[PDB]
Amino acid sequence: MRMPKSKGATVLNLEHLLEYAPQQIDISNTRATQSQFDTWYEAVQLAYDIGETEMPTVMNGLMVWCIENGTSPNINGVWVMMDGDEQVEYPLKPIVENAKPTLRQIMAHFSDVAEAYIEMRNKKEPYMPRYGLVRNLRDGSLARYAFDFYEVTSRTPVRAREAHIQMKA
Amino acid sequence: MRMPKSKGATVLNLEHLLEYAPQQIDISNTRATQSQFDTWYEAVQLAYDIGETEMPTVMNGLMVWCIENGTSPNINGVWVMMDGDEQVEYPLKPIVENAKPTLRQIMAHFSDVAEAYIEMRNKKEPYMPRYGLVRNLRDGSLARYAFDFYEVTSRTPVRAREAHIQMKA
Amino acid sequence: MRMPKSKGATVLNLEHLLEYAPQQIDISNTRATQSQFDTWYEAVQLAYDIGETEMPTVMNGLMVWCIENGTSPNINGVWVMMDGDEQVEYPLKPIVENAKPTLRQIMAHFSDVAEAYIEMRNKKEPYMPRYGLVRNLRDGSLARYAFDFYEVTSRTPVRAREAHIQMKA
Amino acid sequence: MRMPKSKGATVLNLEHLLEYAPQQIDISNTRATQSQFDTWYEAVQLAYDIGETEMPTVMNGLMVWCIENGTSPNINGVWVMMDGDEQVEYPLKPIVENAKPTLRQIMAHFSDVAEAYIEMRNKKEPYMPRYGLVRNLRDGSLARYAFDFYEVTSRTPVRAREAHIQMKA
Amino acid sequence: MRMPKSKGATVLNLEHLLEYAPQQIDISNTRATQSQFDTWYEAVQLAYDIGETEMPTVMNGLMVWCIENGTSPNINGVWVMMDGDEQVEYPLKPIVENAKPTLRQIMAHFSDVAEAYIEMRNKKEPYMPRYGLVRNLRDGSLARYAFDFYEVTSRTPVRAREAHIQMKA
């Protein structure tokens, strides 16, 4: 093999070269960077006039809303939260404006947790996310992966990779 | 797994995260929100000069009309109600103007009840909604699902999902 | 045979003609020339204000970043390095501007080493570069070749040649 | 690179230039200078016979008026303030006079605050400034940029830059 | 080939022509000559009553002003310097006078240094000169070329050549 050279010197080290072991999600372009996610968090927090005691509760339903309604909604719209049987409405402009590059990449930070919620739902009655009810997904084991902000990593079953290709087609 | 992080703190809670259990129809974009449905109700009520004693009766036939004539009609038109053998006419502009985002989403609040009416009809003589007589649906058990404002949830038989895909194609 | 002639004289020699034995990568247009790589190295070094003691470490992650995120990114963007659990951000404009003719050819100097890193990763948990998770590559032995700046030489297995044709299609 | 030279000596420090980091709005010709704004403030104060206890209230209504009626009005005209349900009438020549170079540049000092007021109005009922209701702007998210005295800096989203080009055309 | 001839004798050495290798900027008409620049320097120095200890600081702000406000301003105007938070006001006729042929050609001597300042600003927050924010330049990499007194030589990337043609159109 040949290691990169510049003016007769190696430019890629020898020890740390075979020691750097990052995580796939961290250095991937499918999700927004940590700085971008932080900016989106406070911008949404400042727009809704919510403190640090109710904001975690509010963001629980936004992830659930994006499971069943996607991550590319109309800006001039609203997304719903339910406190009991009442539909509590929130403006959707702050969610999208302050999300860079796209809301899907920002929502991709919720990929791991969103499967836990769907698996919970798939313990009482069959629950299939709408994103999979419009692309004709019949499997009941792939319901945990039927949201548009899912991150495909090197831990995803092969059937799921084919399903997302079929879904997005 | 990794839960969303912002400035070294979890932003998705731990207990209410695995307790929020909404209903699919409530947080879905296939139907208008409760506020939107309320606005459409009074706007139509105020346009027809009807009180709270005949309006429930009038809206019974509007749902039946939309079963057999769809939810995307010409605004400058009329929809018919039958009191005995006489065709009582109502303007159709108030139904569509005041419906946001679309009349189909507003009519989607009648998805559950519209199946009860069709099943009633399918107890004396075979009744197939027109929306299914123009897309060549031959099954007699799918007649209860042959209206354009049907809501596909995680309780719909798999054959029905294929039928609507075939119908809308 | 006929050897090139000009004014009644051979113009291709006889001894050194059958002695010149270059290497395929050196005289190939799939990678930038040594002068071009040197210019890109110092230009990136001068833009980041880094000496000759940390620059080899920084370029380790840029190669890893290009494995999972390609070699044609948006100039007005950033690429991430991880020191522990923190995302250290670098501007991406110096990487692309000063790379001639393209960053893929400049990154092609890292083709040999990038396989060593992937093979390392493929010793603890299955690691498939993202560039192969979006083109539906299922083989686990071709993971070492699933980056866009791979150089196809006369040492590459035949299956790999077909895979890259299928991947790039 | 080459420095500017005069009689064999450098004419630029290039050490304080590294220090020199002015703000874009301060050294821009899109807004009047601080001295010009001070002249306009006192002259308007002297024309309306108002002290330093009601003038801050007075200029609150002037900024809102320029949002909905532009910054190029007739000199022989009036601008309206509302105290309750009554229209308080103010002469408009004191505004369009003593405002150099133009009233738009003087009004550009209110660009930041004018967006806070618009974002306030877009929390109860949809509010689009009349400047955007005559140029066919159908995106309510861009309502915060629909005043002619908006200042385009290097913090404006790319959407707003295209919208203003479309509006001013 | 044919040499220029006069009375049966060559009029060109063609041995010193091989020696003659001038710089493109030096013998270009896009910038004022050295004598013209020296005249503009002393005349501006004599007009502002400033010595040789503060003038290098003074011209630092003038170059930045021309980046964001162009090199064709009104003679009966002022250009702003910032010492801290205060706007220092300077007359602008001493600048647009004693600057022949044009101020742009005089300002062209700062083309190399003006890019260093812009590249400095594009290290903390995105900074695009106002010259490019009014001509719809959406590429932040080309921010280093977004001043009207830029000199196009045979070292400018092909991107910048097309951008300036698009901008000046």
Author numbering:
A (entry chain Ag), B (entry chain Ai), C (entry chain Ae), D (entry chain Ah), E (entry chain Af): 54 to 222
Sentences from the paper on this structure:
Potyviral CP plays a role in virtually every step of the viral infection cycle, from transmission of the virion by aphids, virus assembly and disassembly, regulation of genome amplification, protein translation, to cell-to-cell and long-distance movement. CP consists of a highly conserved globular core flanked by two large extended regions with a high frequency of structural disorder. The C-terminal high intrinsic disorder region (C-IDR) is partially conserved and packaged in the lumen of the virion, supported by the helical ssRNA scaffold. Here, we show that we can control the shape, size, RNA encapsidation ability, symmetry, stability and surface functionalization of nanoparticles through structure-based design of CP from potato virus Y (PVY).
We have previously shown that truncation of the N-IDR at G40 results in an insoluble protein, whereas CPΔN49 and CPΔN49C40 with both IDRs truncated, self-assemble into single octameric rings and their short stacks. To facilitate sample preparation for further structural analysis, we attached the His6-tag to the C-terminus of CPΔN49C40 (trCP). Cryo-EM revealed that the affinity-purified sample consisted predominantly of trCP double octameric rings assembled in a head-to-tail (H2T) orientation. In wild type VLPr filaments, the N-IDR is responsible for the axial connection of the octameric rings, with no obvious interactions between the core regions of the CPs. The truncation of N-IDR reduces the axial separation of the rings by 3.9 Å and shifts the twist angle in H2T double rings compared with VLPr filaments. The blob of density in the center of the two rings, which was already observed in the 2D class averages, was assigned to a cluster of His6-tags, because it was absent in the 2D class averages after the removal of the His6-tag, which also led to the dissociation of double rings into single rings. The octameric ring exhibits pronounced charge anisotropy, with positive (P-side) and negative (N-side) charge predominating on the opposite surfaces, which explains the ionic strength-dependent size distribution of the self-assembled particles.
